[PDB]
């Protein structure tokens, strides 16, 4: 597996691997332990493969959002920074590296979109989204546009969509509710309507993508763009006198970009967890260590307070941190994949006029949340099935058979559950009386007085279950379940034995 007595570190090729290796050299000088910094290809996919088999690097550097997935597969050790060390980093960066209620990585850097503007065309950039239409008219009179940025990817359009109330997944305690998506609320509609209005009023074109926007800003054709630190060096080569500042407000509220946090995780299979902790806390996450990495290739804004104070001398870095603090931590759960595709489709459909804003987002809410909502409903239905089977078994323990009588019916009326026209189980032990009945339908348990094994439960759910949903029931039980009437009133019968 992983060789003890040493540190293998994986970081992406676009980061400062030379500087990190120099921090490694200071570590080997003080301790004798060699540090191998490599930047292999496809590092994001290679780690989950090799780490599951109990191999790989000791420390993996990657954007925090993948780490929640890694943690679910148990590939990451819980880190143990003392309170004194935690206060050296901005509190909001620690929230980006939590899964369950556990710290699962060290925050390194902080990144978010900003407003980039051409100082020659526009020495005072607009504070509000609302004033950009008038600005575009005044600039189109001189052959220039106000604002071009990538409209094809919801990462770039989300700051406006979220400003008045949009969100990806609600965050509560230390967990995301994968059932609560904020794509079709009034705030998200208002933000997307403003975006579409900009396009219908000819202030932007629905076909603008990353390359068109970057080319237009670099050739001084548009006064503003929206982009991240990765784009700065191509504007330097362009020689355009540019600035970087806070994103415009919408309805008086800041734009809310997604925040990406470069993070260092410790492989759960590492026999060098103490060495890795010592390296990350007392060598890398210092002014001297981050300086080493930044001088090789800049980090942007950093989570370490002391060095951020120094990098923030650069107003572009200060703006990145300000937009980040006003933004939304990108959720670190794998359910974001459905979020990205859903919102990407909605924006493209609404911007090109192929759908209304309401239809686009209603569909997107569905595409992002429906599967997870049903999965919860199926699980609660299966909980009821197991609860009914449990009580039926408990009855046999004390009484002759499964049911006392022949049949029992649960039906839900208007917020209450009714049982025949008389109480059945007749107990203080069972009764259950805690069936969610997630599809509000009817349950009917069947038995015939005699030799046992005739335990059949008939469920008549109200509400269409998906193919994926009904097929989950087929893999969970097998030949013991008969879905009849695949249309109208679907009927499900399970033999509880």
Author numbering: 1 to 370, 1026 to 1152
Manuscript text:
Previously, our group and others found that type IV pili, filamentous helical appendages polymerized from protein subunits, promoted microcolony and biofilm formation in C. difficile. Here, we report the ability of two C. difficile pilin subunits, PilJ and PilW, to bind to DNA in vitro, as well as the defects in biofilm formation in the pilJ and pilW gene-interruption mutants. Like PilA1, PilW has a single transmembrane helix (α-1N) followed by a soluble domain and a central α-helix (α-1C) with a β-sheet packed against it.
MBP crystallizes readily and can serve as a molecular chaperone to increase the propensity for crystallization, Fig. S2 shows the asymmetric unit of the MBP-PilW crystal, where contracts between MBP and PilW predominate. Fitting with the notion that MBP serves as a sort of molecular chaperone, the relative B-factors are lower for MBP than the majority of PilW, particularly the PilW surface loops. The majority of the two structures is superimposable, including the four strands of the PilA1 β-sheet and the C-terminal α-helix (which is also found in a superimposition of PilA1 and PilJ); the most obvious point of divergence is the αβ loop, which has a short helical section in PilA1, but adds two strands to the β-sheet of PilW. This loop appears to be highly flexible; in the four molecules of the PilW asymmetric unit, it can be traced in two distinct conformations (chains B and C), with insufficient density to resolve it in the other two. The conformer found in chain C of our crystal structure can be accommodated in our pilus model with only minor adjustments to the backbone, while the conformer in molecule B would require a total rearrangement, leading us to conclude that the chain C conformation is close to the native conformation found in the assembled fibers. Notably, the lysine-rich portion of the αβ loop shown in Figure 4D (residues 67–72) is conserved across the alignment, supporting the hypothesis that this motif is important for DNA recognition. Equivalent residues in similar positions can be observed in the PilW structure, at Lysine 30 and Aspartate 85.
